Design a protein around this ligand. Sequence first.
Ligand SMILES: [Zn+2]
Ligand SMILES: [Zn+2]
Ligand SMILES: [Zn+2]
Ligand SMILES: [Zn+2]
Lengths: 630, 630
Amino acid sequence: TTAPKPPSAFTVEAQRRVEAELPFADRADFERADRGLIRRPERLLIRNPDGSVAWQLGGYDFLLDGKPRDSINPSLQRQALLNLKYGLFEVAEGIYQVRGFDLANITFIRGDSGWIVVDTLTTPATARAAYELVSRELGERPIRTVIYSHAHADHFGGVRGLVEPQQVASGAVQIIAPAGFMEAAIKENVLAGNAMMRRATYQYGTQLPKGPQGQVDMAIGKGLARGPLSLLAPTRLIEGEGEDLVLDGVPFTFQNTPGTESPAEMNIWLPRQKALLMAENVVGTLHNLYTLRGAEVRDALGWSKYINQALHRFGRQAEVMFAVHNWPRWGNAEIVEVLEKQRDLYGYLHDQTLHLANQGVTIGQVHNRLRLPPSLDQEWYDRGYHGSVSHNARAVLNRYLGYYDGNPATLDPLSPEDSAGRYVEYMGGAERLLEQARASYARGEYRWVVEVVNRLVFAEPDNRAARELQADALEQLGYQAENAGWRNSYLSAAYELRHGVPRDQGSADALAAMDTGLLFDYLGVRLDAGAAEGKALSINLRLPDIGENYLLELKNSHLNNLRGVQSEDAGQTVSIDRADLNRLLLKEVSAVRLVFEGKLKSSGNPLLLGQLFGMLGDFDFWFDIVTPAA
Amino acid sequence: TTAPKPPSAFTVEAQRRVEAELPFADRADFERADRGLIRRPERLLIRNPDGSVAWQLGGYDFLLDGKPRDSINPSLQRQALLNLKYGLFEVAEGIYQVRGFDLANITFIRGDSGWIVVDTLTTPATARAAYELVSRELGERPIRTVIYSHAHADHFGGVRGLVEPQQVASGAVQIIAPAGFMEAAIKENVLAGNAMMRRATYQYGTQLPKGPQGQVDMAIGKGLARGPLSLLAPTRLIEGEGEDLVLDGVPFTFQNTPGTESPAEMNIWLPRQKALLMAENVVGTLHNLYTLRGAEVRDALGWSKYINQALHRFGRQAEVMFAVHNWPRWGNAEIVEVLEKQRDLYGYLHDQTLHLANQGVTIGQVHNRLRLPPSLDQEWYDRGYHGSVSHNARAVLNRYLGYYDGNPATLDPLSPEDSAGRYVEYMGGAERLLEQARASYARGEYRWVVEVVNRLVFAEPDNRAARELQADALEQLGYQAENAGWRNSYLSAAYELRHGVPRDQGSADALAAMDTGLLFDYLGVRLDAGAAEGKALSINLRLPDIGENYLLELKNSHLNNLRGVQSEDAGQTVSIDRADLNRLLLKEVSAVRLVFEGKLKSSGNPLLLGQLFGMLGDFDFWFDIVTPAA
Ligand SMILES: [Zn+2]
Ligand SMILES: [Zn+2]
Ligand SMILES: [Zn+2]
Ligand SMILES: [Zn+2]
């Protein structure tokens, strides 16, 4: 069958073990998450301008009664219910948050004459809804300052729902960010963007229903609001180690924590309230050193040290600690302990992964050997809801030693679709492998079943019996998973094995924010090597609006670009505003039109830029993951 | 049997294919490598002070006749013979190199009154031997300037064979390096050091004999000299983009290429000779983006761009191009082409890996899909002797997307020693798996055999039949490998499967150069978590010779350290020179003695530092790789 199955006896038993192993009697988070509530609006529904729906929570009504569901890990169920504590809250005097309107929180700090707003959610409609809630409960006041705590779309993406460019231009609104915001806001999402976004469908569970056999939570929030991605550039950057400022009479200390959860990030200390806003360094979960959708491995050592610096600078004096995800902590001794343990969590993960690695434990083993000590294991905010000890330990190991385990048996591996037929043959053929795998399934050996049956799937991708057993086993693993990403991934893979992948199926602000060099780097990634083979051309590119020149050199099937160089020998020189180049690439405009408008001038051979663009391919979104290519 | 086998018919056929596919008629490198030879001394043998042998080449006499050996890839054999072109050479007027005295080259540039020396080989004895050769052939002159081209031990390691500290102290010798040398010289070799050095035994083939069924070459040189590792700190750093200097009347342009082959590296342009020294950005082979022994993935995009910057700055004017490995290129048009193609090699590798990845091709497949275009494939300096297209394409993919393929079948994998029994069972048991694997072996399917028989090895590590077949198959892959690291690794793995791993079995200058923060980071990696569990202590550490204070905080089984902080609440305060702390850790001294000498003062609880040190474990070098733990 093609539908979700009940949790097996083995999965049920695994959930009871979770209950035996974790501190469910510690219910203090339920108090914390309701503390200071001003309004929880009754039927949240946020729509976008084009009529699409950005966010709603009605889907999670099944969680409200608190009754345990064996298709959900009970530790994950606990988090899922706590993340449903949404609405407008007071953190401290003149400090509020709107939580559960998006993946992240949005913070409103009362100024003498207006608000200082920290972060802006993922899309303008959710930010605007949050602001409207604030206005209704607390009174309407202008926003004079918007601060980006760090460079991720769930923090800067809704900025246009709060402010417009003319308010920035007139100086009515400042935008404050850590130095390195603009580079960090775009870079890592670009060159490998289609791969990352497709893989993220699994981690976010975008094709799953909301429900007990579907998506239930996203660890740091319910999920990501859907809508246009906005971004307005900072007018003031916090440099070096940080800075002390006064904003509309309120004193702010910014502590830059470069290269932890984001390349550009800062904590915020508010001495008048003794309130510490920990960016996304410290949330209600272990975070990602490595995000499954795919990016570079983060530095656990620097992350751990930056938390210790916060602890040393502010920990002694903090009365409340709050975050850009999840809920606050009140009281100095609690806050000190949370900081200490989070510092030591990332620290232990790092140091002990390398301790094992130095003993010869490989990237293929470390997750099955590394275990937190009780002092770190037994806090709810250290649980692997977003990150996991398992995939993080692997990541630290991969950061230091790479993907290769050291064993030359694995140095030149056959692609799995090329080794699959032989695995299957050696195992007695498809029916015999299925027979053996079903017996393994009936002993609950799901981690093994998904390994071996995946071989049959890759040998015989249209074998329905193998797809359905693989899916069943993956599902049970998803039911079992404490980690929301893991859960979403397993259930998504079962979904695609049962149903197949979608047959039926870019932000202008993001493009504007991309450095020109990176834009040409991406066009080089698009280059179709067959079309480029044996060609050679070069183009001088002049961009007067931004005062930058590039030299583009196509040769040996590689597109090169260099900032601030021109060649007397280039075959063509193209003058074009970056803003117009952007419009061209977003297909808001044609090349011919820009000529006619006096916006795209050319000397030399006028065909070369057209010829280069004609060499660029595109990528299909819905690539195969759990089977080989159709 | 336990001894190397003949190349099989299939391996022989693979070598003939190599000959059919690669441009062996292009023999110009043989001219290049002999050009300007002044002396090749007849029986090179370099000894260390303790009586050990640092370097000799008699082992490779089998290569001298040029006759093809089917146990060696003929493209690798070609490189192996070219790397045997050792001795003292002229590059251009007043510019010489000693090649083949170590893995790297050492360069002597004639000053008005002395030598400027670029790099220093791996150990003092090989440098000193090189210098003595120079003195005999060209006359004895003092060295006034030593330059480190980049931060690797094969470049700075022999410096004490050329100069002593008092010559530095008096200002008779300057030492010039790129900014970031001292950090780069140590950092990446530390935290994961034992794992990297053990794994390197394979890549370097340290247990193999020199000979046709053993080690034959190390791509960028013959091999690494063995001896003490020296390092003296730079007295002058080249900052920013680079610098123009005159040294003993000779004009030098330094072009910093930070973050390519090393974090701190620079090319050198000598306008008087029109001579371009390309550091290790450009060598006689494709280089590592990822070195098998294990380190972080290098940035192919920046590497490619830095070569293009060199090409644009100097390429137009260069008459000779030479390197810190391998041999020079003469003539402007040849030099331009080599730069272009190397730029596009790293560029193509990068862009096309991501092109495929954006199509859904995973880290498990990309090496079997990515192929260089003919213009890059068909040059000898683009061959994968040191790096490979295969392991590099995987590395670029791992840099951008990580180790995880996106398929949740592989998200929570059983350790191989835990899945092995089940693979073996499913395949009919050990004899049946062996029976099938031998038939596969007899069709030449060695890449498959080493995958499947490795499963039997990990299930049954004392199964001699499985070890010996695994070894045989690995060996044939080593015979076949164009890459010297791959070859050494396969042959080393066969060696350990047949013979078992060694039962019978630190630089003071390196330790001195390590940043104190990193030293305490490493001690944290050593922390035995069982011994630390439930303990908490803190220590103020004061280091007067270096004017630095640290705060050490042990808690939650994690050792923390913070530069420039002290705590009034620390349980102990220890004052100690860094130099004395180093001696302590190198066991050149005892803690008690330093007290008695007035060099280690303490207040507060005097036991805490001792207690912390007693929690630190150590690592065994000779860990198991090709089998599970004995
Ligand atoms: Zn973030
Ligand atoms: Zn966030
Ligand atoms: Zn190097
Ligand atoms: Zn080198």
